Amino acid sequence: STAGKVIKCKAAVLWEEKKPFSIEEVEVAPPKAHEVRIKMVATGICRSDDHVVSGTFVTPLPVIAGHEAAGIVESIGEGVTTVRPGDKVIPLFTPQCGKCRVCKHPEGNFCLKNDLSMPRGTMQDGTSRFTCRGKPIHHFLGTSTFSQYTVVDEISVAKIDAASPLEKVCLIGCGFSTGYGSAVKVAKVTQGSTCAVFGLGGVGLSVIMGCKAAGAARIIGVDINKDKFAKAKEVGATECVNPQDYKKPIQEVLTEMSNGGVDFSFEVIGRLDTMVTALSCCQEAYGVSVIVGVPPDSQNLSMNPMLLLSGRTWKGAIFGGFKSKDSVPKLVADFMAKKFALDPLITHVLPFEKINEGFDLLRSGESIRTILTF
Amino acid sequence: STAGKVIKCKAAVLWEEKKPFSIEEVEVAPPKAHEVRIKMVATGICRSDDHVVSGTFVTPLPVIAGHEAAGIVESIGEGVTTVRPGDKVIPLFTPQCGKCRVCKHPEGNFCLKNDLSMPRGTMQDGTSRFTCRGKPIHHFLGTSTFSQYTVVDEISVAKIDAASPLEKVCLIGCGFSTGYGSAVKVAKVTQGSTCAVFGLGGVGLSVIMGCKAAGAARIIGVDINKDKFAKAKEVGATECVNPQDYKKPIQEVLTEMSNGGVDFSFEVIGRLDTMVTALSCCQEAYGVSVIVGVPPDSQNLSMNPMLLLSGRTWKGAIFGGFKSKDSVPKLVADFMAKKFALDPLITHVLPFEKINEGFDLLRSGESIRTILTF
Numbered sequence: 001s002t003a004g005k006v007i008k009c010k011a012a013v014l015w016e017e018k019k020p021f022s023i024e025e026v027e028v029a030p031p032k033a034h035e036v037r038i039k040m041v042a043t044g045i046c047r048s049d050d051h052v053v054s055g056t057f058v059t060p061l062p063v064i065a066g067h068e069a070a071g072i073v074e075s076i077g078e079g080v081t082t083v084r085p086g087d088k089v090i091p092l093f094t095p096q097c098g099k100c101r102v103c104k105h106p107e108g109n110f111c112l113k114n115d116l117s118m119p120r121g122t123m124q125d126g127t128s129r130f131t132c133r134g135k136p137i138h139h140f141l142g143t144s145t146f147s148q149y150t151v152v153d154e155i156s157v158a159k160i161d162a163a164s165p166l167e168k169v170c171l172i173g174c175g176f177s178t179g180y181g182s183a184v185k186v187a188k189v190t191q192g193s194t195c196a197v198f199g200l201g202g203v204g205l206s207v208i209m210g211c212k213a214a215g216a217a218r219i220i221g222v223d224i225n226k227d228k229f230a231k232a233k234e235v236g237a238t239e240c241v242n243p244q245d246y247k248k249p250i251q252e253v254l255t256e257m258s259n260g261g262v263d264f265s266f267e268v269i270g271r272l273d274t275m276v277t278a279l280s281c282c283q284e285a286y287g288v289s290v291i292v293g294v295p296p297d298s299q300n301l302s303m304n305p306m307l308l309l310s311g312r313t314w315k316g317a318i319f320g321g322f323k324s325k326d327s328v329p330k331l332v333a334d335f336m337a338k339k340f341a342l343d344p345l346i347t348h349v350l351p352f353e354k355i356n357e358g359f360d361l362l363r364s365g366e367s368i369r370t371i372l373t374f
Numbered sequence: 375s376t377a378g379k380v381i382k383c384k385a386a387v388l389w390e391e392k393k394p395f396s397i398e399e400v401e402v403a404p405p406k407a408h409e410v411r412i413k414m415v416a417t418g419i420c421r422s423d424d425h426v427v428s429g430t431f432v433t434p435l436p437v438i439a440g441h442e443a444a445g446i447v448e449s450i451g452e453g454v455t456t457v458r459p460g461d462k463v464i465p466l467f468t469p470q471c472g473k474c475r476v477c478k479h480p481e482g483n484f485c486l487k488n489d490l491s492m493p494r495g496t497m498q499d500g501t502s503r504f505t506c507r508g509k510p511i512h513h514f515l516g517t518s519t520f521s522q523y524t525v526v527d528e529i530s531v532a533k534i535d536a537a538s539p540l541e542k543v544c545l546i547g548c549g550f551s552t553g554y555g556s557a558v559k560v561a562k563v564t565q566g567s568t569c570a571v572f573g574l575g576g577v578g579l580s581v582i583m584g585c586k587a588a589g590a591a592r593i594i595g596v597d598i599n600k601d602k603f604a605k606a607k608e609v610g611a612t613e614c615v616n617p618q619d620y621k622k623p624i625q626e627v628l629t630e631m632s633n634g635g636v637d638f639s640f641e642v643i644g645r646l647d648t649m650v651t652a653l654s655c656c657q658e659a660y661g662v663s664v665i666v667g668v669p670p671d672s673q674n675l676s677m678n679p680m681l682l683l684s685g686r687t688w689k690g691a692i693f694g695g696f697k698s699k700d701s702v703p704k705l706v707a708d709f710m711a712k713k714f715a716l717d718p719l720i721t722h723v724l725p726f727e728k729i730n731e732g733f734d735l736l737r738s739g740e741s742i743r744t745i746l747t748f
């Protein structure tokens with residue numbers, strides 16, 4: 001039995017920004033009280049993991065990244081009540097402690113125990129469970145899924161259906177749930193509305209899925225890579241536009257196309273300029289714009305507050321507004337009942353050992369989601 | 375009889391920015407089709423009128439300003455069906471055409487016929503009804519209430535209760551309705567919540583009234599003029615704070631006071647820095663911030679979009695979100711039924727001839743609302 005023992009396993013360590021991951025042996029400590037050690041089965045490559053590499057999202061290095069994943073519990077620390085060894089689980093990059101003022105609020109989900117606002121790269125107790133070459137290695141968002149084994153706090157894991165296909169449902173740990181919830185929960189897209197979705201990657205495609213599920217009449221996809229348009233239309237886009245094709249700014253184009261502005265817009269890229277464009281293209285009196293993309297570290301946008309005074313609503317969210325531990329198992333159950341599809345997001349499959357090729361695919365524009373198998 | 379004739383009457387003409395109003399004779403043309411000529415009874419001094427004087431709010435000059443008022447219909451043009459001679463009325467600086475996409479939307483109120491976005495300073499037909507010393511004089515927001523008589527489009531006037539005290543209910547034409555609706559309709563303040571209100575002038579006091587009516591448990595008033603605090607507490611503030619008293623930025627103070635951020639914040643001043651402060655002091659995961667203050671012309675704010683990505687909602691509104699022609703008569707009926715008070719907003723009552731003394735009271739910090747009586 002490995003219970004109570006250090007596990008030696010392979011992980012993808014990021015020693016430096018703007019460098020390939022290093023696949024090499026790490027030591028994974030056993031779980032302490034209220035911790036869970038997970039044998040990973042599948043993990044997706046999310047652009048947010050690439051943001052760690054590029055320095056767009058600052059978190060302490062060296063680090064084991066990865067946050068979109070599914071696995072099987074290897075062991076539980078003292079006092080764990082919500083999972084058992086052998087359970088299928090999805091790590092939760094947004095925890096759900098159940099006790100803070102956000103967890104108790106009917107509409108909050110950004111639990112105060114998160115490691116996203118001001119990342120420390122540790123477990124809840126301020127320490128690390130990972131050693132590599134004798135050196136402590138940081139965690140990422142309390143998940144660190146680019147490893148054959150990880151250790152997470154109990155508030156950062158959800159038990160899911162024992163019959164779940166882990167190589168699909170790992171996407172419920174980030175990209176699918178984020179995009180879908182941003183439409184259905186955060187924006188609250190209405191039947192018959194017109195939506196504009198900026199960025200047609202895995203998260204933007206999931207936004208489109210949610211807009212279509214909510215009954216939008218028009219869903220306009222916006223991307224500078226026209227190779228993204230075919231899949232966007234397959235999952236519900238009615239029109240796609242490439243800003244590079246137009247002489248005028250795309251907010252003017254979208255305002256014209258929607259006969260005075262869209263009902264709902266979504267920024268699903270991570271650029272300051274497209275956050276402001278996406279706000280501007282929603283109707284000035286009653287439009288809603290949702291920021292989903294992660295902005296570059298410490299940079300401020302500039303905007304004219306008259307865009308809000310006329311009546312627009314501007315909001316953002318983490319993880320589609322879903323309370324993570326309550327919602328992830330329900331989303332898996334709904335997937336099992338065919339209430340939504342995940343295959344449209346999966347364009348590539350690789351073994352974990354080919355993680356760097358998976359990041360190459362994302363950076364070239366060729367992939368939506370690559371799923372890595374351990 | 376005056377019907378069908380030019381009226382020569384007294385008005386307050388603003389010939390150029392940053393000068394006193396000139397109280398002098400103007401000619402007021404009779405109403406054309408679908409227009410209404412009103413004998414003014416009372417008009418309030420709103421900070422937005424001072425924004426015209428100061429160049430904070432750009433509108434064509436020379437101009438008859440004034441937009442918060444009540445009067446009696448003198449005559450109606452062909453085709454008017456909603457008011458008759460002798461009716462008490464409130465001019466609507468936000469029209470309600472009933473035909474545009476905003477008017478048809480359940481939550482929109484910023485009718486596309488407004489003259490606020492891109493001010494032309496005319497009637498709907500692109501012409502003026504005012505002459506002074508042989509020169510055409512612009513309208514202001516389709517109202518122009520600093521005149522013994524004005525002409526408005528039918529979509530810019532509402533009939534109110536014949537028994538209405540016009541020297542009080544003129545405030546339903548702007549300041550009361552704007553603040554009250556910003557709380558009850560735009561923010562949708564909840565029972566038991568904590569609110570922060572930046573700016574304790576007539577509009578901010580009306581926000582406090584709305585927050586109290588909605589059942590807020592805590593209402594924190596914020597002003598650099600501590601002379602505003604006593605009246606803020608009278609109408610429902612539980613605490614007041616002056617940013618000048620603190621070594622820390624007031625967003626940090628308010629976050630500490632509210633044990634992690636307020637539920638609802640309101641910017642009721644018109645400064646870029648307080649718009650960002652007000653957003654920052656609402657709880658990062660579920661807080662709502664409403665911009666009510668009018669920003670200085672053409673100036674952009676700077677902010678970190680992580681404030682929104684965590685879950686905040688940022689919105690603004692004109693006229694408290696109220697559909698103007700539907701709402702103004704109901705607000706007057708509610709005032710007549712003692713559902714809210716207006717006297718706390720009224721600090722001074724002067725003859726119209728003292729308009730410049732009324733503006734000096736506002737600029738000195740000494741008044742909330744001055745009502746001018748014709």
Ligand SMILES: NC(=O)c1ccc[n+]([C@@H]2O[C@H](COP(=O)([O-])OP(=O)([O-])OC[C@H]3O[C@@H](n4cnc5c(N)[nH+]cnc54)[C@H](O)[C@@H]3O)[C@@H](O)[C@H]2O)c1
Nearest residue numbers: 047048178199201202203223224225269270293294318319
């Ligand atoms: N809020 C959350 O909880 C959360 C969760 C998951 C992802 N994210 C972020 O969401 C964003 C999208 O992630 P993803 O879908 O994995 O990324 P992705 O697959 O890189 O997709 C981004 C898309 O944006 C397109 N694009 C780039 N620049 C422009 C431009 N100027 N105009 C229009 N399109 C452009 C690009 O071609 C690509 O198809 C990233 O910033 C992520 O970090 C946020």
Ligand SMILES: NC(=O)c1ccc[n+]([C@@H]2O[C@H](COP(=O)([O-])OP(=O)([O-])OC[C@H]3O[C@@H](n4cnc5c(N)[nH+]cnc54)[C@H](O)[C@@H]3O)[C@@H](O)[C@H]2O)c1
Nearest residue numbers: 421422552573575576577597598599643644667668692693
């Ligand atoms: N959105 C709308 O439809 C609408 C309607 C009416 C008024 N307005 C605007 O709302 C704002 C308030 O109008 P009002 O109540 O008539 O004005 P007001 O009576 O001048 O009140 C403004 C208050 O802000 C206070 N103040 C000034 N600077 C600061 C600061 N740095 N920090 C905190 N307090 C400060 C000031 O002392 C005063 O008590 C103005 O910008 C108006 O133009 C908007």
Ligand SMILES: [Zn+2]
Nearest residue numbers: 097100103111
């Ligand atoms: Zn929590």
Ligand SMILES: [Zn+2]
Nearest residue numbers: 046048174175
């Ligand atoms: Zn992600």
Ligand SMILES: [Zn+2]
Nearest residue numbers: 471474477485
């Ligand atoms: Zn209209």
Ligand SMILES: [Zn+2]
Nearest residue numbers: 420422548549
């Ligand atoms: Zn006003």
